[PDB]
Amino acid sequence: GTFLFTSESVGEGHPDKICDQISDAVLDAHLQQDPDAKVACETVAKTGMILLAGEITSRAAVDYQKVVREAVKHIGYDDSSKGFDYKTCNVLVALEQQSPDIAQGVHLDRNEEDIGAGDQGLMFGYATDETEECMPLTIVLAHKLNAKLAELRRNGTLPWLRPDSKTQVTVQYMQDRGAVLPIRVHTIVISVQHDEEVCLDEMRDALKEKVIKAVVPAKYLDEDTIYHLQPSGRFVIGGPQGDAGLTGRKIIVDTYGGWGAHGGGAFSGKDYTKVDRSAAYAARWVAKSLVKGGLCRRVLVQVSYAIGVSHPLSISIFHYGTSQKSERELLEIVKKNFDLRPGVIVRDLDLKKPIYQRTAAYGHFGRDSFPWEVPKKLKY
Amino acid sequence: GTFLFTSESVGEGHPDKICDQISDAVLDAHLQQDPDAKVACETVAKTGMILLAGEITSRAAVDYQKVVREAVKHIGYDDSSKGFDYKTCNVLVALEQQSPDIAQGVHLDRNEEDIGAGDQGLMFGYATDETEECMPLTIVLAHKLNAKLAELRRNGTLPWLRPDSKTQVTVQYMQDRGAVLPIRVHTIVISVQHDEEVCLDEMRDALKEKVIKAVVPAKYLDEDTIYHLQPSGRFVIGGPQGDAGLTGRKIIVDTYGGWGAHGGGAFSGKDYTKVDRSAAYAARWVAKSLVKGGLCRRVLVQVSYAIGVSHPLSISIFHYGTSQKSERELLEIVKKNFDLRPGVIVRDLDLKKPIYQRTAAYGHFGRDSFPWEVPKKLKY
């Protein structure tokens, strides 16, 4: 009854993640001045270039050059030796107003609570009791390995590190009546951009001793564990110079690491009226409320919308066999306890607050007691 | 024990799908001349602009202006009145060689069968017996609604239609020992860009009578079915002018419409050495082979890779309770029947053939008897 499951994560300097962080720096800059900004900011990154493309209608006055360059500086791309420099890169802007046809169909002359969804689409929330934060262990560990690399880069412990990294964790699980229990780490991958001088053996030793052993409990590592550390052999070229990045190309890293399900929408660069983000956050909040409320050990929630319509078109629950209550009964508890209109989710989850850049690396879920991570006390 | 499930699809002129089709037009143009081209072509679209960004190492001589404009012409964006015109748009190119550090770690001086995965990552395959093609009914119907809009646009039936469209289908299902059986269509959304002259009532009537009734069997539609037809009320501005598009932002439309699982990787613009595409195609082939072989009614397959390593790091099977065989026994049948190294998948699935633009609208799976849709006869 044991099985393997694999999740990945990427670091703050992975080029896709650069784009998510910049898109959310732009969103936060707008929301600091105009809580009702309509923002749909995509970012593209390639050698020497950040391009902003999309639609923003806002009363804010935002200095895009400053906002983009400060985000890149924070990530750590500050010199041509590293492949990218916030001081000297090109910042190109192709931003227009929100389509008036979308505005009139979504929010023009609507009561806030009765604002339409900003698009159609489907969204999922997931929670699992295998960790306190109700996240899969594979993705938590993958994120923490990237965070550890950034910590050792920033504290000068491993000064050959650059910001672009990827990690991947395969866990052997057992099943218990549809719940899952981690047993051991079967395989770890780490790839991280590095300077021209450090040798492979020095990097592999440091990644095992100072990264993996610092993050992963010894009880999960044994003589069988497989390590793929700098498996390409050389990763000097990195960041956007090694690989073009785009906003919304890490949607599985952003959510559950492959567990549960995904409706396809990207989070970063979008205000609350874009249900791709707000309804996925609300669905996480529902799922985590069901698990912390003791109604199931793990659960998947689907919701869906039509553009211009406030109430969800569908709400669905899958409990993997981990509840005494039927999925019908759980769906009735959800409908009695939650209002998933976007103009209500914004109030419950405080989604005009400019905290979005903080969500755009290391996953949107399972961290920092954001509002969607604080369970609602359920009445039934 | 009934439940709702929702999937969406988008049309050929949805701005994200424009980008996927251009990325794959570029890939095909390279493969026509150099079957071993290394291609990683991202496309971005906004008003008046197609930008290509990424990495290509190829012996081909490709006219990017011609390839991009021909793809946009095929989609139907041929006049400023429609919001985009292949004849007059800007085509910008930011394409460099493949990173030499990736090349040396993946494929340089490797036997083809023993080429390394072109990246780490995780990928899933899915199949379900609810349709002959082993796809979920929700996503099949959503795709066919977009195809019907394009057909009636191209045959001049509904000359007010433009290429940008979205559809969404919610089906009520029953469960039968982990298999799922569609009962009825609960809700349909259609949004499609249109000309300045046609009125809402004319469009809603046509969408119901000439689109929905042409596609969806009457046995699924009843007095309760909910229709959201042009729910925004106005969609004259569309294509990249209404919404920026990027390659790899429709990964759930490309796969199973939310069913099964997704590892996060985009398909379009990538040659076979990028396991995001080749291993997802191979995992579909495995899943469909298990269902057509009578071993399960539905099944999810996970695989994962490390950059530079040929064999998968993990392979996993979830049969939703729909097999007499254990998931362990199914995994042993998979391992005895399939070799999921990328340099073997390329031979089994013929992945140097320039047919990729054909995959880049209406889903990659369940259509046209591509190699990954032809089940393998299993020995066990």
Ligand SMILES: CN(C)c1nc(=O)n(-c2cccc(NC(=O)COc3cccc(-n4c(=O)nc(N(C)C)c5ccc(Cl)cc54)c3)c2)c2cc(Cl)ccc12
């Ligand atoms: C009620 N009914 C029948 C419904 N059926 C449905 O399929 N979905 C539904 C629809 C769309 C998508 C998904 N996505 C997933 O739940 C499947 O997802 C994953 C992902 C990642 C891992 C696993 N998974 C895993 O979790 N456990 C495993 N164990 C414990 C063996 C496992 C083993 C191997 C593998 Cl490859 C995967 C495994 C499974 C489910 C429903 C959704 C709703 Cl909201 C309501 C009702 C249903």
Ligand SMILES: C[S@@+](CC[C@H](N)C(=O)[O-])C[C@H]1O[C@@H](n2cnc3c(N)ncnc32)[C@H](O)[C@@H]1O
């Ligand atoms: C392998 S690249 C994707 C394929 C690439 N576009 C190509 O042209 O082959 C994806 C990610 O892997 C990482 N990467 C880049 N160069 C790498 C290298 N030399 N070794 C390992 N990983 C690398 C970076 O995080 C990058 O964003």
Ligand SMILES: C[S@@+](CC[C@H](N)C(=O)[O-])C[C@H]1O[C@@H](n2cnc3c(N)ncnc32)[C@H](O)[C@@H]1O
């Ligand atoms: C609603 S837009 C995403 C949000 C948009 N970026 C914004 O600025 O609000 C997503 C997709 O919906 C469709 N769309 C565009 N304008 C629309 C309209 N007026 N009514 C309905 N759907 C529309 C197009 O397919 C577009 O690519």
